[PDB]
Amino acid sequence: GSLTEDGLSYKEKFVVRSYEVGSNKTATVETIANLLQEVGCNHAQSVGFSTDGFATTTTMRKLHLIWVTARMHIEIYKYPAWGDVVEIETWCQSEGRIGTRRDWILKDSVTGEVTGRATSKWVMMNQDTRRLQKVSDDVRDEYLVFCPQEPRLAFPEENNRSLKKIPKLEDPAQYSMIGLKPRRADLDMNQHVNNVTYIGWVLESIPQEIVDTHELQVITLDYRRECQQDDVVDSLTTTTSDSQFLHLLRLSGDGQEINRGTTLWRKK
Amino acid sequence: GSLTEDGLSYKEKFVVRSYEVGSNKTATVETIANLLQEVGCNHAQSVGFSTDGFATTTTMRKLHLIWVTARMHIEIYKYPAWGDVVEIETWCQSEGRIGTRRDWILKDSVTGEVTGRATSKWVMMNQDTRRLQKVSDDVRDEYLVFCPQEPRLAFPEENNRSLKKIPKLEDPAQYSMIGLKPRRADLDMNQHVNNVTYIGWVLESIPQEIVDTHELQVITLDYRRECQQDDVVDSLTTTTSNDSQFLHLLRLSGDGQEINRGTTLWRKK
Numbered sequence: 001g002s003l004t005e006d007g008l009s010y011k012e013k014f015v016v017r018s019y020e021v022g023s024n025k026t027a028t029v030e031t032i033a034n035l036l037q038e039v040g041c042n043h044a045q046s047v048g049f050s051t052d053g054f055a056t057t058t059t060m061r062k063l064h065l066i067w068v069t070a071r072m073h074i075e076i077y078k079y080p081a082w083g084d085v086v087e088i089e090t091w092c093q094s095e096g097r098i099g100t101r102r103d104w105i106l107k108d109s110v111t112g113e114v115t116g117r118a119t120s121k122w123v124m125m126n127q128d129t130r131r132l133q134k135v136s137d138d139v140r141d142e143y144l145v146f147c148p149q150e151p152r153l154a155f156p157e158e159n160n161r162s163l164k165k166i167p168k169l170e171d172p173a174q175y176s177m178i179g180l181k182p183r184r185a186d187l188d189m190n191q192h193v194n195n196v197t198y199i200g201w202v203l204e205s206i207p208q209e210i211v212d213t214h215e216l217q218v219i220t221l222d223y224r225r226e227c228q229q230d231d232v233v234d235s236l237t238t239t240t241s242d243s244q245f246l247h248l249l250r251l252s253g254d255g256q257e258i259n260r261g262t263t264l265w266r267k268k
Numbered sequence: 269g270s271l272t273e274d275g276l277s278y279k280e281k282f283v284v285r286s287y288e289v290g291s292n293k294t295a296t297v298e299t300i301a302n303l304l305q306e307v308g309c310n311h312a313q314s315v316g317f318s319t320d321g322f323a324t325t326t327t328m329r330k331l332h333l334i335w336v337t338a339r340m341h342i343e344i345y346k347y348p349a350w351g352d353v354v355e356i357e358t359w360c361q362s363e364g365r366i367g368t369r370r371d372w373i374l375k376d377s378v379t380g381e382v383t384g385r386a387t388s389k390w391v392m393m394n395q396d397t398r399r400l401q402k403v404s405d406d407v408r409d410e411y412l413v414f415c416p417q418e419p420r421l422a423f424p425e426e427n428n429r430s431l432k433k434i435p436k437l438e439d440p441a442q443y444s445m446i447g448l449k450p451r452r453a454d455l456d457m458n459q460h461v462n463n464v465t466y467i468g469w470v471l472e473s474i475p476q477e478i479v480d481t482h483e484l485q486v487i488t489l490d491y492r493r494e495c496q497q498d499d500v501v502d503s504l505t506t507t508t509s510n511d512s513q514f515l516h517l518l519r520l521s522g523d524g525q526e527i528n529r530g531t532t533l534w535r536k537k
């Protein structure tokens with residue numbers, strides 16, 4: 001991978017691996033989410049930011065400030081097959097004092113056609129107290145020189161799925177997967193649960209029949225709270241409809257919300 | 269990746285990814301096990317075998333026969349760091365009518381030094397009944413033309429760790445991780461639990477303090493039975509020993525049916 005000619009975006013090619021594909025011989029949504037995260041890390045490295053998953057500046061380091069994901073939105077038109085090359089282009093944009101946005105475009109390296117797109121909203125917080133805060137001028141000046149100044153949106157449409165409000169699932173849930181625990185493979189270098197594990201946990205309550213007859217087209221996921229290594233999760237799903245589902249991840253004990261989301265599936 | 273000059277082995281380079289590393293900023297043993305499996309699959313593709321993880325042939329496919337892992341042995345000297353390039357060389361050898369063996373050599377692409385090695389024993393089995401069988405001559409003739417004829421061992425030593433007998437852990441276990449279930453990310457294209465998930469499940473009963481102060485040097489794992497998508501696993505560990513040795517057991521949460529047994533060797537950082 002490498003930054004583009006203007007240094008305002010980053011590109012990388014990936015060949016789909018044997019263990020990365022599902023029961024349809026194509027990449028799973030978790031493999032896709034992992035590749036977006038890898039190209040995002042490589043973009044942060046290429047311009048001097050931290051690489052621990054927090055894209056930290058020298059100013060953020062002294063103040064114990066980290067970038068955290070608040071929302072992830074992924075739309076896939078074609079899942080690459082095993083052995084295929086997928087090219088991902090990624091860039092960042094400042095959203096004033098609200099936070100930052102990372103966008104992605106996925107293409108077939110052979111045909112050049114757009115096979116998917118993603119958007120994510122990041123927010124600034126203290127790593128110790130977990131308190132959210134607005135982006136100050138001193139930290140904006142450090143990352144704005146790596147962002148295009150004119151808006152460049154992966155989801156430009158007025159009233160698109162990426163900015164829709166998500167409701168809280170009502171009990172009883174139609175479907176559920178109870179007792180989900182992270183293992184060491186689910187943790188990052190900082191011993192925190194990887195953001196991709198939550199996507200897998202959300203999809204665990206979708207019945208196998210839906211997975212077998214449909215393909216996942218859109219997934220929107222809000223991140224409310226982190227799941228600790230010793231926490232236990234319950235995954236809840238309800239059909240709201242193409243098939244649409246409303247999702248909720250909550251702690252197995254107290255029922256504390258960690259994530260909420262929506263999925264859209266198409267018939268094969 | 270590509271087959272070497274003589275077409276009797278396969279090589280591939282991999283750059284270590286951000287999400288593939290652990291708390292030490294180096295590749296986990298599960299990332300290593302995944303890469304060995306990927307290079308093994310690419311070697312099977314390059315010579316016309318099936319790619320579903322079973323390296324079949326038209327003859328095995330006719331009789332519903334698949335290759336299944338009976339033992340995996342991995343020894344790591346240096347875990348590659350994130351951003352480093354690791355080169356893996358893999359080859360197969362026939363073990364007469366017992367089955368096949370797949371060996372691996374891991375090297376630092378920059379220095380050329382051996383940073384790890386692995387060996388695996390595979391056995392012929394009917395897909396449907398799960399019954400093992402000795403390799404027939406018709407099958408042997410199909411894969412021998414892709415194997416070196418003279419022995420080429422990743423673990424040549426006379427009384428080495430890869431061929432040691434593993435005992436069954438006695439109750440009570442010193443350590444345990446109960447209620448382990450596979451999710452969809454743990455399944456392969458054939459909807460079977462990936463062999464790498466069992467390695468992760470074995471390591472879950474090792475205390476976090478051991479992981480934090482030691483590095484995994486050797487892991488030997490026997491595969492007795494397959495874990496279904498709806499099965500629940502219990503991981504059991506007992507210290508048998510600067511070096512720490514453990515005895516492992518994976519069994520079904522209900523009936524206590526054995527699925528795996530193994531050993532690990534760790535050294536102080």
Ligand SMILES: CNC[C@@H]1COc2ccccc2O1
Binds near residue numbers: 044067092102122143
């Ligand atoms: C959380 N993602 C945005 C931060 C700040 O701005 C960045 C600009 C370029 C590369 C990485 C960047 O990381």
Ligand SMILES: CNC[C@@H]1COc2ccccc2O1
Binds near residue numbers: 311322370411414
């Ligand atoms: C179970 N693994 C060995 C089988 C048979 O012999 C092979 C030779 C070369 C590549 C793949 C091979 O697959």
